[PDB]
Amino acid sequence: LVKMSHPSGDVEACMVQVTCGSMTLNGLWLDNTVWCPRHVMCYDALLISMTNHSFSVQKHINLRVVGHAMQGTLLKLTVDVANPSTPAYTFTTVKPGAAFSVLACYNGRPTGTFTVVMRPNYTIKGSFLCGSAGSVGYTKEGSVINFCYMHQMELANGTHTGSAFDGTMYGAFMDQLTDKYCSVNVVAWLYAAILNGCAWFVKPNRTSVVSFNEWALANQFTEFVGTQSVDMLAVKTGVAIEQLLYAIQQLYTGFQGKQILGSTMLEDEFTPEDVNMQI
Amino acid sequence: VKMSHPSGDVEACMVQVTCGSMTLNGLWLDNTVWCPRHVMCPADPNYDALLISMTNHSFSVQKHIGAPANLRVVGHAMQGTLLKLTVDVANPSTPAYTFTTVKPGAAFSVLACYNGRPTGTFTVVMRPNYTIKGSFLCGSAGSVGYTKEGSVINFCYMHQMELGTHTGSAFDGTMYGAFMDKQLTDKYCSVNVVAWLYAAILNGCAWFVKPNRTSVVSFNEWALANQFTEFVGTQSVDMLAVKTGVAIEQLLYAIQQLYTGFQGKQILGSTMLEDEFTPEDVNMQI
C-alpha cells in the first residue's frame, strides 16, 4: 500500500506561468484556454480594470492573451495558440473521500506530484508552498484526464483548498468545519490489512450500517456508504462490511499496543478502488 | 507528505521489449534500450547460453506512448542483470541523465509501467536490507526509478523481481542486495529518523529534546545491535539542526531512549518511529 499517483506527463505539458503585473502563479493551458486562479489580479472591480494586455502567459517546460473572463474564483483566459499537447479531458467535481493526484508547480514549472484525498471538510492535506496557486489535481480514466482541482490557498498549518474548474471553491471558502475519518476508506484499509494476512482485529461481532452511522455522528466519523469495490473486497476476504464496522468502533478506542499494516492509528487515505488495483 | 518527481521526462522514454513469448518494459535513452535480462528466459538459467541463442530479430521494441514508433534492434549485449539493446533510432526525447547507485535511506521516484505504458508513480526509500516496498504487479519488471537534480535525471533502479518486498538492479548491472534472477533483517534508517524528529521539532512536538547527548561514534556501535543503521551526517541534516538549534547528538540520544517505547506519548501522531522521510524531504517541505 503505497500512495500511488497518476503519471504526470499529460498534465506537465499544460502547465504555464501566468502573470498580472505584481502577482504570478501557475495556469492550466487546455486547447485555446488558460485557466488560473483569479486572485492573480489582486473582484469585478478588478476584472473591469483589466485588458488582455494586463496578463502575460509563459510556457517554460509564445502565448498572447486575446480574451479574458471570470468564472467563480477562476480566470478563464483565451490565447491565440491551441495547446498541441492537450489531453482528452473533462471537468468533474470530486466528492469527499475520493482520491486524486496533484501536480505541484511553481512559476509554471512542475516540481512534485503526490496523492491527496478530498477530506470530509473539503480541504486537502498536501504540500503547497508560496507560489503554488494554480497547481492542478486530476484523475485519469482511460486516456481521459479528469481535471478536478485548482489550488488556491492555505488555511491552517498544512491544510489547503481550491477550485473545481466550474469556478466553485470546495467548501465555499472565500478567496473550516472539523475533519472526520472517511469511514469507507478505513473499511477498505482494513480489508487491505486482511488481504495481507493482518487480520488480528477481526471478531464475529458486527455493527449494522444503520447503527454505525448513528455512532459515527457522535465520534467524528462520516457516514458509511458502501460501494461495489467494497463488496468485491468483502467477497475475496469472506469478511462482511458489518464486521469491519464493529472493529472500527473498537479500534478508535485504542489499538492497545498492536499494529495494522505498520500503522498505529486508522488510515482513511486509501479508497476501495486504490485497494483493489494495488492488491 | 510522500512526494515524487514529475514523471513526464521518464514517461517519454518507456518502451515495450519482447523476446519470444515474454515481454516487459525497457528504458530508451539515445540508441540504447535497457531492460532486464530475464526477458530471454522461457516459463536456474544460463544467461550466457541464452544470449548466444539470441539472433538479430530475437528482440522487438515497441513505443506506445506519445509518437508511436518502430525501433529495430541493431545489436544486443549483456551487463550484469540487464540487457543493453542497441536500436537504430535515437530517442528525440532523451534528457540530461546520469547513472548513480542509491544507498540505503535515500529516496527515489518509481514510474510503474506495464507493456511499455506508464500506469502510476510513487516514492520509496531504499531499505537497509537493499529492498524496496513498492506496488508492483505482473509485467511491471523494467519499471524505472530515478531522481532529478536540476534538469538532470539520475536513473538508479530498474525493477526486476518480487521477493513481499521488491528489488531490481542499478544501471551498471548490479542487483541491489546481490539477489539473483533465478533477505536480511531490515533496520531502522537512523538519519531519516533524525530528520523526522527534526520535523517534529520544527512543527512543535519536542518533548523528547533532553540536553543529554550521545555521540555519533557511540550511537553507531550502539546501533550495531539494536537494529539501526550507522548514522551519517549530511549538509541537509546540518540545515535542520541550525534552523532548530537542536544538535544531532541530542536526537541520537532520544532515539536511544525512544526505541524502548514512546511510553504513552506521541510524536507527529505516531507511537513508532518514521524512517521514510529524508533530511532533504524535511528541508524541501518546511
Q: What does DSSP assign to residue A86? A: P
Minimal-distance CA residue of chain B relative to A269: B1
Q: Which of A2, A7, A196 sits opposite B111 (nearest CB)?
A: A7
Report chain B residues touching chain A, CB-CB < 8 A.
1-8, 11-12, 65, 111-112, 118-124, 133-135, 164, 203, 269-272, 285
Minimal-distance CA residue of chain B relative to A128: B285
Which residues are within 8 A (CB) of B36 and not within 5 positions of it... i.e. 6 or more apart?
B24, B81, B82, B83, B141, B142, B158, B159, B160, B168, B169, B181
d(CA B11, CA B16): 12
d(CA A115, CA A113): 7
Burial-class residue B285 by CB neighbours within 10 Å (0-12, 13-18, 19+).
middle
Q: Which of A7, A114, A259 sits opposite B118 (nearest CB)?
A: A7
The CATH fold of domain A11-79 = Thrombin, subunit H (2.40.10)
Top residue of A1, A5, A275 to mutate, by most chain B CBs within 10 Å, is A5
Top residue of A1, A2, A116, A136 to mutate, by most chain B CBs within 10 Å, is A2
Q: With b meaning 16 or more CB within 10 Å and e meaning fewer, what string describes A3-29?
A: bbbbbbbbbbbbbbbbbbeeebbbbbb
**Distance from first CA to last CA of chain A, Å, rounded?**
8
B253, B215 contact by CB (below 8 A): no
Span A183-278 CATH architecture:
Orthogonal Bundle (1.10)
d(CA A110, CA A115): 15
Answer whether A114 sits within 8 Å of B3, measured CB to CB: yes
Answer whether A114 sits within 8 Å of B8, measured CB to CB: no
Widest Cα–Cα separation across chain A: 68
d(CA B270, CA B248): 21
Cβ neighbours of A53 (radius 10 Å): 10
Q: What does DSSP assign to residue A224? A: P
Q: Which residues of B touch A59 (CB under 8 A)?
A: none
Sheet holding B60-63, edge to edge: B69-71, B60-63, B14-19, B22-29, B32-36, B82-87, B73-79
d(CA A81, CA A32): 6
Answer whether A114 sits within 8 Å of B271, measured CB to CB: no
d(CA B213, CA B211): 6
Which residues are within 8 A (CB) of A84 and not within 5 positions of it... i.e. 6 or more apart?
none
Crossing angle of helices B190-201/B235-244, nearest 10°?
Answer: 30
Alpha helix (H) residue ranges in chain B? 8-11, 47-53, 190-201, 216-223, 235-244, 248-259, 279-285
Q: Which residues of A touch B3 (CB under 8 A)?
A: 104, 112-114, 127
The CATH fold of domain B190-285 = main proteinase (3clpro) structure, domain 3 (1.10.1840)
Q: What is the resolution of this structure in A?
A: 2.8
d(CA A26, CA A15): 7
Residue recorded with cell 467535481: A93
Report chain A residues touching chain B, CB-CB < 8 A.
1-9, 12-13, 61, 103-104, 110-114, 125-127, 157, 196, 259, 262, 264-265, 278
Query: Matching CATH topology for A11-79 and A183-278?
Result: no
Q: What does DSSP assign to residue B188? A: B
Answer whether B164 sits within 8 Å of A103, measured CB to CB: no
**Distance from first CA to last CA of chain B, Å, rounded?**
11
Top residue of A1, A4, A103 to mutate, by most chain B CBs within 10 Å, is A4
B169, B131 contact by CB (below 8 A): no
Q: Which of B1, B12, B272 sits opposite A9 (nearest CB)?
A: B12
Just give the CATH number of B8-87: 2.40.10.10
Q: Which of B11, B135, B285 sits opposite A9 (nearest CB)?
A: B11
Answer whether A6 sits within 8 Å of B120, measured CB to CB: yes
A232, A222 contact by CB (below 8 A): no
